[PDB]
């Protein structure tokens, strides 16, 4: 149920394919939605989750460089997919920016995204 | 054990008192060390820890306003005191800055500090 198009609360789009071998591949499109706003993602997921009604663990990375721009940073999302009625992916993320040594303390931000199959407004 | 003067890897000073009631009170002094660089802290700790070798959980908050300046932010440190030879307090911290709603998603930095009694 992972494969498909997901949207987070800010309107970004996560286009993902879940491979039989545990691979996640796809495209992350920021809310602006144009050609300059598409970035490659790669990740991994639990391809044989527990049958006790637990979620499916997964993670992925985007480095914020494409042919139009480079933000010298990367964001990882760690979370789980929860299937059923209104499926969702619940995640927490870390965004680290390349910095000098003296600036390593503003290098990493933390936050949380919820992805659903429905786009919000 | 906890009560004392502590230093992080960067040169800040953590001056704390651990009360019988579980309270942490004190002052956080940034690396500069002048009067403008002292901030009030308050926190809590487990006053009856396990005796199985486990550390003592604790946390505290600094809001980055004193009588001289205001950085419209607050940092919380969450961690544990590990006593004995070479006592340490190992922590992870979250720094949140006041932002508008449009900028919330970039409001909080995370990082880690280790405090020792030797500077």
């Amino acid at each position: 149920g992972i494969t498909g198009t997901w949207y987070n609360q800010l309107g970004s789009t996560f286009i993902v394919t879940a491979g039989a071998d545990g691979a996640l591949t796809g495209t992350y499109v920021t809310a602006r939605g144009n050609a300059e706003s598409r970035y490659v993602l790669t990740g991994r997921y639990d391809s044989a989750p527990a049958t006790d009604g637990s979620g499916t663990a997964l993670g992925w990375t985007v480095a914020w460089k494409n042919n139009y721009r480079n933000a010298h940073s990367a964001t990882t999302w760690s979370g789980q997919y929860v299937g059923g009625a209104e499926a969702r992916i619940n995640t927490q993320w870390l965004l680290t920016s390349g910095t000098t040594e003296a600036n390593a303390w503003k290098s990493t931000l933390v936050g949380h995204d919820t992805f659903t199959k429905v786009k919000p407004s | 054990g906890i009560t004392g003067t502590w230093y992080n890897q960067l040169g800040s000073t953590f001056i704390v008192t651990a009360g019988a009631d579980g309270a942490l009170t004190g002052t956080y002094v940034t690396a500069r060390g002048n009067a403008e660089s002292r901030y009030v802290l308050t926190g809590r700790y487990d006053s009856a820890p396990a005796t199985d070798g486990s550390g003592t959980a604790l946390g505290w908050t600094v809001a980055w306003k004193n009588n001289y300046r205001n950085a419209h932010s607050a940092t919380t440190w969450s961690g544990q005191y590990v006593g004995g030879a070479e006592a340490r307090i190992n922590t992870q911290w979250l720094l949140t800055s006041g932002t508008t709603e449009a900028n919330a998603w970039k409001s909080t930095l995370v990082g880690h500090d280790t405090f020792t009694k030797v500077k």
Binding site: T30, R69, S73 | -
Partner: peptide, 6 residues
């Protein structure tokens, strides 16, 4: 202005 939040 980071792209993740634009």
């Amino acid at each position: 202005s980071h792209p993740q939040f634009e």
